[PDB]
Amino acid sequence: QSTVAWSRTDWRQDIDADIGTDTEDIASMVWVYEHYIRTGVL
């Protein structure tokens, strides 16, 4: 859905494709999850 809505904002881009970056290359972009949470984990 996060990719569908984006690739449908236009009809040119496809975020889930390979622009040419090698997977082992350190600069290879990867999806990370950032979160802000109010909770007593303690």
Partner: protein
Amino acid sequence: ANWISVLSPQDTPFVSMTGKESINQTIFSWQTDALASVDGNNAHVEGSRAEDGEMKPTVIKSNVTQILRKVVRVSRGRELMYQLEKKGKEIKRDLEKILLSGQARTDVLADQYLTNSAADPAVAGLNDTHAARKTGAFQFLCAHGGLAGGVVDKTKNGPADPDTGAVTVKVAQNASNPTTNIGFDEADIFDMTLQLYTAGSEADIIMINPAHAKIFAGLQENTQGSRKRIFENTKQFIYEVNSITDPLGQSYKIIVNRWMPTDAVYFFRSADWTQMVLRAPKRTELAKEKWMIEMEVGLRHRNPYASGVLFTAAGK
């Protein structure tokens, strides 16, 4: 709902573990056979009187590259890009399945690849003499000992290298069962490690079909009572093995790949294998509304007696 579900099994460890290297010809070649033997005694009586040396120079090995089409035919919204990516994944899976098969390169040329004089003289003017380029597979380059026409024979061990006696391709012999169960012996991979150490491969990776991991899993246990797990108030039941060390001190990391033939196991190594490519995947169309892909690729192997293969069956 505005999405689709796709399993997309895309392990592909081998392709990322072997890298790649571009070439400038549909047929590449390297040359490496071995070092000279030991000959044992080399005493002398103060005189050479040689015979022009016993160099016996290296042998020249080559391989061929094949073609993959995976045509696209249009007669989800824009289904074009979807089917294109799907076919791309499918061709990648097909490559991973082929490069690990037992194919053997077959073409009109066997050892005189050049034949610049002839080179199929009856080709121009009619252009319909098209033969089928078939590349060399994994089991073919790993010091094989035969081939059933176009496939490597899975019941014949390989020859020995003159440098040091080593048989890097052997027919497994599970001496534990009376030839009923199709599984690795407890000491059949260690024999491969011994042979590789004698030949000096330095491999440290082993690909395996999930239809055989149960063997290594149970290997950590036994019935005689000399090997058993323990759990000291532990809320875990780890049942897995991902590392082996033969008595020779050679480590070996295990990895699983579903695209291998069930009746075989492979001993890979990063640098010893390289993926040669000539034509990159291009989205295009034929001559003067379809789409298509065309990927020219070939397989290269540094030295046959480096990597190892082992067939699983019962002798008969």
